[PDB]
């Protein structure tokens, strides 16, 4: 559907506003100010006013790299390089200059295994001498060069092969953030992840700096005096959490100006509330249904599809996929803010979506019933569950915590799986808390005692999904490994995919193979919404709005 993307307040702004922002999350703030050491959407957003985890590049509304931001980037096809130019007046919040080594240090904080980051990808191996650096065969990155020294403002990255997503943000073939080397160099690489200098007392490049950080709660942003861009209108921004149960109570209380990331089900409650304008955009988002099909070997950085389970059979994967009544749930609870997904690529990447692709958006109990009958799983008319060759078809469902419907939705899906002869049960007879879910799935090697789970994402701003599902990917929580899906992922970023007609097809095949193989079953695409208080001026969700934090302001007390 169609909302406003920007709240267009004609009331001009005051000198010194005290904005009060919040993000919905029932888990403590996992505050990490180094992009390469963080893997959490709540803090990606909360790091905004402080330069969104120190990102360099401005972009257009379609995430294509534009000039004007902290740095420019100049791609060249003949050279097979990206020349990255730091602004001369780009400094850290303590007043130190941002220079060549700080950018390069970001590559070290991911590529060097000593820091314990999860964000390396085969995509980074495309950079010259970087893979050898990662494995420890070379003590420097030969591809990354400093045309005017470490204190200079230019970095030159030589690639092996150019890639079509390099013109767009989130591509993962080169990095877009800096780390303050001087401030951090003397902290032990292994200690960096949990250091106060990268959690509670960081240095930043953005328009505001974190004066104080209450761990697992809040940040107090004040204007960063050493910012290159415009002088912000606001005096101080407070960015907090903000649980799901207390969100509406907080809006009715007029406690927050902005609340980002509210669940779709609270929208019917929030619409009625006056004193707020509700904006909305196409969320860069996907929800999934994971099947545990193996583990991740970190020693060799590789997905191994070795877990013993009926979900190793293609039909069972599909059948369980076809059973779910997502459409029902989304209508009953999600107020037209979540649409069942037909594939892994969300509509925001409209070029590469297509209604020729059918997925699991339509409930098809009858086809699922067949699919199971055709794989030797016969229904036991006594119990109404399918038995094959001795063993009863039963699976463990690691459902997560969510809104007030969370509990009802999970039990609803059991019924549906019961309807096709599968016996599903909740993990440890209870819904799973998020942070513990994260640990259970994201920590290697992988849990042994769950069959099904759900998993949401704030996707990268480039449609390619190599970081999520590639063989070497640690974010492949199902842990499948399929040479055909490896070929699809690769063909999308091939030299032939510079021609967008070709890549359009490579993305389709990927989506059709990924639905047919059914290693992961797509659940929902989603439209964002943010309630902005009527006193706020200059607010917008527009992607390509590059100065929102500078231009935003208030006008007295909240409505």
């Amino acid at each position: 559907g169609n909302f406003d993307v920007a709240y267009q307040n004609p009331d001009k702004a005051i000198k010194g506003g005290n904005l009060k922002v919040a993000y919905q999350s029932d888990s403590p703030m996992k505050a990490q100010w180094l992009s390469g050491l963080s893997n959490d959407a709540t803090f990606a957003t909360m790091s905004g006013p402080g330069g969104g985890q120190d990102g360099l590049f401005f972009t257009d509304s379609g995430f294509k790299f534009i000039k004007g931001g902290a740095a420019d980037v100049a791609l060249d096809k003949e050279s097979k390089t990206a020349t990255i130019t730091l602004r001369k007046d780009l400094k850290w919040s303590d007043g130190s200059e941002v220079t060549a080594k700080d950018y390069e240090f970001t590559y070290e904080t991911i590529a060097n295994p000593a820091y314990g980051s999860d964000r390396w990808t085969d995509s980074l191996a495309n950079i010259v001498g970087l893979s050898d650096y990662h494995t420890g065969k070379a003590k420097t990155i030969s591809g990354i060069t400093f045309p005017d020294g470490e204190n200079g403002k230019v970095i030159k990255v030589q690639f092996k092969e150019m890639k079509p997503g390099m013109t767009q943000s989130g591509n993962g073939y080169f990095l877009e953030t800096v780390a303050p080397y001087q401030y951090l160099k003397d902290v032990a690489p292994k200690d960096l992840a949990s250091s106060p200098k990268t959690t509670t007392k960081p240095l930043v490049t953005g328009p505001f700096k974190p004066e104080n950080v209450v761990a697992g709660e809040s940040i107090k942003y004040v204007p960063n005096p050493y910012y290159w861009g415009e002088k912000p209108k606001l005096n101080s921004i407070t960015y907090e959490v903000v649980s799901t149960a207390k969100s509406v109570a907080a809006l009715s209380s007029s406690k927050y100006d902005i609340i980002n990331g509210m669940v779709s089900s609270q929208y019917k409650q929030v619409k009625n509330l006056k004193g707020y304008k509700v904006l909305g955009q196409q969320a860069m988002y996907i929800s999934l249904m994971y099947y545990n099909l193996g583990h991740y070997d970190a020693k060799n950085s590789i997905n191994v599809q070795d877990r013993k389970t009926p979900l190793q059979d293609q039909n069972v994967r599909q059948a369980i996929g076809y059973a779910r009544n997502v459409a029902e749930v989304d209508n009953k609870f999600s107020n037209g803010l979540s649409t069942p997904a037909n594939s892994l690529i969300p509509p925001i990447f409209k070029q590469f979506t297509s209604s020729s692709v059918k997925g699991y958006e339509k409930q098809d109990l009858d086809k699922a019933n067949k699919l199971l009958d055709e794989d030797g799983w016969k229904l036991n008319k006594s119990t109404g569950y399918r038995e094959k060759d001795g063993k009863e078809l039963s699976l463990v469902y690691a459902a997560r915590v969510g809104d007030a419907n969370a509990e009802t939705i999970a039990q609803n899906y059991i019924q549906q799986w019961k309807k096709i002869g599968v016996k599903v049960s909740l993990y440890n007879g209870k819904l799973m808390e998020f942070n513990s879910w994260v640990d259970h799935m994201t920590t290697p090697p992988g849990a042994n005692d769950w069959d099904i789970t759900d998993g949401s994402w704030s996707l990268a701003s480039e449609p390619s999904q190599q970081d999520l599902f590639s063989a070497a990917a640690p974010y492949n929580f199902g842990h499948f490994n399929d040479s055909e899906i490896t070929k699809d992922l690769n063909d999308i970023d091939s030299a032939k995919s510079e021609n967008p007609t070709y890549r359009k097809a490579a993305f389709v095949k990927y989506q059709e193979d990924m639905n047919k193989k059914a290693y992961v079953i797509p659940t929902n695409f989603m439209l964002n919404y943010t309630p902005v208080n009527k006193r706020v001026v200059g607010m917008t969700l527009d992607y390509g709005a590059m100065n929102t934090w500078s231009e935003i302001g208030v006008s007295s007390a909240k409505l």
Binding site: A44, G170, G261, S287, R400, G455, Y475
Partner: peptide
């Protein structure tokens, strides 16, 4: 942007 885990569904 970059790929990030969400609490949503």
């Amino acid at each position: 942007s970059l790929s990030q885990l969400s609490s949503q569904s």
